[PDB]
Design a protein around this ligand. Structure first.
Ligand SMILES: COc1cc2ncnc(Nc3cnc(OCCC4CC4)nc3)c2cc1OCC1CCNCC1
Length: 270
């Protein structure tokens, strides 16, 4: 067994809510860890199946993420498990607290006079370079993100982006084949990465302006894809475009994308 993943619940003090989703919530917290303390980010969830089957499979997956070590992939400190007021297991995943917050909010704030100012092209490409390196590290270990989007990418204290908030087993990030067959592969993550690239290049735009969520599958079925942004370089749009090919076998690997973006940033007068 690898029970380095389970943290004593009495070492954790829960604070103010960062956000409330359908699954769970994200909150500020303090971890005793040594007489000292540490500011952390806590993600609560609510499982099903009272028996070991569901919780052990979740624990195994938690042990996997903890044993990861890369600057562009969020580090998982541990997991506390408490039973809820209804008898349901409530796992609480503990990560380091990210003061600069998510990448999606930072991009929209770069368009406001408070906080960050205009993000130059080179800084936008570095963000993409960072996501691509973290994603490449994940696929070279056969781990599927399942929920890659700009709101799930965090800015570290040195201002390098890491991938976070992985999904387990939003329409506008889901690959065409995954909407019809519900089959999720590495190319479905490549699809989501292309959408994330478009979020960065548009500086926070919601994908497919004008198209409603319920009409997305049919829209993609007709060969429609995200339109090229204003002032977006042609070479850059062709990179994100290659992520959305109808046949997933036509999509490029994460090593090819990372190589493409790094070669483009190095071609600019940075
Ligand atoms: C200063 O604000 C944050 C700091 C964070 N510092 C670290 N982590 C975070 N979130 C996070 C959660 N869960 C996971 O992974 C779970 C993986 C497990 C397998 C399921 N990774 C990251 C933060 C979110 C923050 O703001 C949340 C936003 C603010 C903007 N309006 C919407 C809510």
């Amino acid at each position: 067994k690898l029970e380095d993943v389970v943290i004593d619940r009495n070492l954790l003090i829960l604070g103010k809510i960062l956000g409330e989703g359908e699954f769970g919530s994200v909150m500020e917290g303090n971890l005793k860890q040594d007489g000292t303390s540490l500011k952390v980010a806590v993600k609560t969830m609510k499982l099903d199946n009272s028996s070991q089957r569901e919780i052990e499979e979740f624990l195994s997956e938690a042990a996997c993420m903890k044993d990861f070590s890369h600057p562009n992939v969020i580090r998982l400190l541990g997991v506390c498990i408490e039973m809820s007021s209804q008898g349901i297991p409530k796992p609480m995943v503990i990560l380091p607290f990210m003061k600069y917050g998510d990448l999606h909010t930072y991009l929209l704030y770069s368009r406001l006079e408070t906080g960050p100012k205009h993000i130059p092209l080179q800084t936008l490409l570095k963000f993409m370079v960072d996501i691509a390196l973290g994603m490449e590290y994940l696929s070279n270990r056969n781990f599927l993100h399942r929920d890659l989007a700009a709101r799930n990418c965090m800015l570290r204290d040195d201002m390098t982006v890491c991938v976070a908030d992985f999904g387990l087993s939003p329409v506008k990030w889901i690959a065409i084949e995954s909407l019809a067959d519900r089959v999720y592969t590495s190319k479905s993550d490549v699809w989501a990465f292309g959408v994330t690239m478009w979020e960065i290049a548009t500086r926070g735009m919601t994908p497919y302006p004008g198209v409603q969520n319920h009409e997305m599958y049919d829209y993609l079925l007709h060969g429609h894809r995200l339109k090229q942004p204003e002032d977006c370089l042609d070479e850059l749009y062709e990179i994100m475009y290659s992520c959305w090919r109808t046949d997933p076998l036509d999509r490029p690997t994460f090593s090819v994308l990372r190589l493409q973006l790094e070669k483009l940033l190095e071609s600019l007068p940075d």
